[PDB]
Amino acid sequence: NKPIKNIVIVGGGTAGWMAASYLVRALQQQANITLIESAAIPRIGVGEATIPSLQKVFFDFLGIPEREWMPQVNGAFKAAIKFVNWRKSPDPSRDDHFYHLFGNVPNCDGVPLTHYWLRKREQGFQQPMEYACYPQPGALDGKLAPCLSDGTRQMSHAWHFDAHLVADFLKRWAVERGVNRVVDEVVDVRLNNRGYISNLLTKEGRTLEADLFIDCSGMRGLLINQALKEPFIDMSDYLLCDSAVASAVPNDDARDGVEPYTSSIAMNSGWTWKIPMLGRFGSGYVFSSHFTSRDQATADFLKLWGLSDNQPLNQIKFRVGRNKRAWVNNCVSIGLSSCFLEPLESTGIYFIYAALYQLVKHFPDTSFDPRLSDAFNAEIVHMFDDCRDFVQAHYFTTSRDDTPFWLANRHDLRLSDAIKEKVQRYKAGLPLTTTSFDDSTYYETFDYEFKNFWLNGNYYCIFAGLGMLPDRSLPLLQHRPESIEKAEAMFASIRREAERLRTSLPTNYDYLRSLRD
Amino acid sequence: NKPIKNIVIVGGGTAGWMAASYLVRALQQQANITLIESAAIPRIGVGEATIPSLQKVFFDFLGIPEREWMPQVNGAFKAAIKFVNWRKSPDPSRDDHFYHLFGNVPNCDGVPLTHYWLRKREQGFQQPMEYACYPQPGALDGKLAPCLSDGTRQMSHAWHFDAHLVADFLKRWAVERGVNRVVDEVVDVRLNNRGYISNLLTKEGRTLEADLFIDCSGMRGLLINQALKEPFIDMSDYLLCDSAVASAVPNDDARDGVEPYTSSIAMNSGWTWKIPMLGRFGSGYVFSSHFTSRDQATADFLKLWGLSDNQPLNQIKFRVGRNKRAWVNNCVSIGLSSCFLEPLESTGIYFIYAALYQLVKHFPDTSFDPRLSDAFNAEIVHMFDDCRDFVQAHYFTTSRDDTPFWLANRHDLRLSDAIKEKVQRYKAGLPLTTTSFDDSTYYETFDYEFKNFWLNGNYYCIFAGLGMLPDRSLPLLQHRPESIEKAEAMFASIRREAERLRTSLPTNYDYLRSLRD
Ligand SMILES: Cc1cc2nc3c(=O)[nH]c(=O)nc-3n(C[C@H](O)[C@H](O)[C@H](O)COP(=O)(O)OP(=O)(O)OC[C@H]3O[C@@H](n4cnc5c(N)ncnc54)[C@H](O)[C@@H]3O)c2cc1C
Ligand SMILES: Cc1cc2nc3c(=O)[nH]c(=O)nc-3n(C[C@H](O)[C@H](O)[C@H](O)COP(=O)(O)OP(=O)(O)OC[C@H]3O[C@@H](n4cnc5c(N)ncnc54)[C@H](O)[C@@H]3O)c2cc1C
Ligand SMILES: N[C@@H](Cc1c[nH]c2c(Cl)cccc12)C(=O)O
Ligand SMILES: N[C@@H](Cc1c[nH]c2c(Cl)cccc12)C(=O)O
Ligand SMILES: [Cl-]
Ligand SMILES: [Cl-]
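YS: structure for the whole thing
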């Protein structure tokens, strides 16, 4: 079979430029890559929060160290997501926050520390789970950097940045390596009688042909949805939000610092993200138009930040779900053309490079063996549905009952069998997936992470933070007092490390300034 | 002169039965009215959107309160038309909607609030015009009823209903009051040598005579066009659409509510109406066969609602324009036999009862003084051409340039001097027609409304919603800072009222259910 020689990518957003740069890197020889992007159709870039695999799977693959790309996209550090007002009727007099941290909880004699923490809590211990089981949250409260001043990493972390600058950075990188860039707009897609894409007709009269087409056209799914008519599986029975009102807000970094984390602030009918960088934070009230008008959401959002009627707003809508198949015939959808999940756990750009990684793992020749795309499609389904369930798990486990939106989340969602099973194991007191690896190994072993994306620590951070605890601690632990004592020593180590970080890390603001102002 | 004694109405659609019932009411004494309608020729009833004058001019005249006719026609409430994707290249990621609301914008020291809104916008104010100047659009976004639960009206509104049931309701009403109903089909019309209608010959052998004939035969204009040969002024140089593909679509009212408004969803080569009622919405893609085939339009329409090849479709065509004269000799055309304009602003049934109102205002004796019909004809010309221009104003002011259809609308339409003049005044920053009345008074003073049908607020809703703003705010306002401050207080009142409506109105779905399931 003849190899894929010509590849056309439609779209110049994060997805398109990730596709171009990843493919130019992966396909060392025999690949002519052309990216077409409209000057008249905006890209989506709201100020984006990311996860550690962005470096390990994407930028390492390209050979670009963090210190190289990060200042060029005005990047800032993210060590967690902090959830605010998710636990109860929010009360202005009560500190209701919890973190979802990156990295693994240690095990003690084959049992995660989360489980020894729960046993302690049963005996009256008051410290919240993540403060007991992770060394860094206090440091995040102090707004400290994830690294010592000399760059030595001290916690697992990822990044906040404007996705426009990332696309820009990658456009530059990809074009210097031979990606052909066409600024133009596809207006028509011709399919042959078998349903394979033949060519694209552009507004300026170009006809584009390729062996393989990558649809990075964004939510419109120009190729996959509009031309190939792949059904989009609407998942608004799983997740209620379908909208956002977003903006960027100046930050007084010198008086207030830069939070080394994304915040998710629960609202009446959704939640608001906060994504700090130097000088500004991006923020969006993600909402369900079924429970609040865009009008009321906008008022709620402005009021949250003390913003004025003169404040500019980005009024976004989205459909939650994914294509029935990401790759149909000679077209692979990547990015918003493939799926969307609300940014509650920073998985959007993850879906782009994880899908690109999978595409190269299932790379076709010009015969397009359906066994390859079928395998690829099943990986994407698992990747997305798994994240959808984890995100959904933040909603149906809420104890908030103070609005129709929160009541509908408690009562009216459709739950996969897979999520119910996990919730059942959790409530029984069983660990979810645990690894013996350290973080370095986990984040270096993408075939493992991709299939074991949400571990025990991730579920515990969310479920325990939300106030849903297991019915009881692990029965095994009643037979293991020595193991319980060793766990105490591990809790004491973690506390030592927290205290060392407190006095050793530079502020996130100072460290960011030091790298590049 | 002998009075009109015998009146024959040809046609049993909305127009015929409105004519019968209006005339039986108006002509208290000396009137024998006969309506002939074919059992073999369908009526036009697609699910119809209406305006507040339907109650005030038509049903009040008959003495039928809203609460009486409305459940009998399975009516639902309409508080606006919402225009979707009319502003730009539609983008699935962007909320592009605006409302055209019923009712007046308040004035502040002789200047409409629209003008104070524009000055604010010049200074960076971001709220869309209709959300600033009207209290109800947020409530429509929340799908709320126009009335409190006890029926107290809270906004100006009209109705959605199947026009078949209205005809049915009025048939019953008119026959109980002495209208003679003949189910039969006119096959021939005899004119005397002077060109006056002598009699109608029916398929079943009846000969019908009358002093006055009302042509409600629909688009075929059996009497006015076919028998009297009155020229129809084709207006396809003004407006491009000549076709519709229509259907009814089930609605999940319990999960999705019932939108208290008509939607107009701009397509590639026209627009699609949505007209919600209980259990279903009527919908039609109105299109120009010059830019899209009926085939492609049908595919576009099915795709819009995720409908299947098994979905039933009503494939409509129409000619846009009006008779040179509505009333010729002893024949008055009323309804589709008289004129057609696409349903972009819900004027079809309006044309029926406004024309009937005018007919009674110009009512003849058997001498048929041409001065009466000449006056009547000039009123109809003004009524129709005025609406034609307002509808046309939605098209030529578009910023959409993404298809041939939208480009032709931007560049290729014939514009009346009257519409150019208005657009010129608008762009200069001048108010169009303003009233000092409240809505109640406007909607109660039909001689005023009929001549001042589209006010400043109506033009602003459309022009501002479409993104065509005046070159600058009213120069007068630079001399009136106190007036500007008073306008602020009025903007604050409107916001208070919006917020009160949000928490006080029942959902439109709940209120409709409560009245009659
Ligand atoms: C509200 C919101 C919040 C988000 N938050 C996060 C977050 O915190 N973290 C994270 O990782 N991700 C987040 N995401 C996801 C992320 O922003 C996007 O997935 C990502 O930035 C790339 O989107 P895309 O490239 O698939 O599509 P787009 O950005 O929509 O780019 C589309 C491209 O296709 C081109 N195009 C479209 N049609 C044509 C055509 N006809 N001819 C030629 N070109 C065409 C456009 O010009 C553009 O270049 C968020 C997304 C949304 C909507
Ligand atoms: C696509 C479309 C969308 C519309 N949307 C709206 C809307 O949203 N809001 C609104 O207010 N209006 C709307 N209208 C207009 C409205 O539907 C019609 O004007 C109205 O319902 C009445 O039409 P009519 O009675 O004049 O003619 P028809 O409904 O066509 O009725 C014709 C009658 O004449 C009879 N007839 C014809 N020839 C003979 C004959 N030879 N002998 C005996 N009887 C005969 C027929 O049997 C029938 O009874 C719309 C119209 C169309 C076409
Ligand atoms: N395997 C993923 C899990 C994850 C996705 N988003 C996260 C966030 Cl936002 C915080 C903590 C962990 C995650 C990771 O550790 O990066
Ligand atoms: N004088 C008319 C103007 C009008 C016709 N159609 C409309 C619609 Cl569909 C919305 C708002 C106003 C109108 C009215 O207010 O009813
Ligand atoms: Cl995301
Ligand atoms: Cl109409």
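YS: worth flagging: Residues A 51-53, 80-81, 100, 102, 345-346, 449, 453-454, 458 surround 7-chlorotryptophan (ligand 3) (CB under 6 Å).
IM: good catch. Also Chain B has one domain: 1-517.
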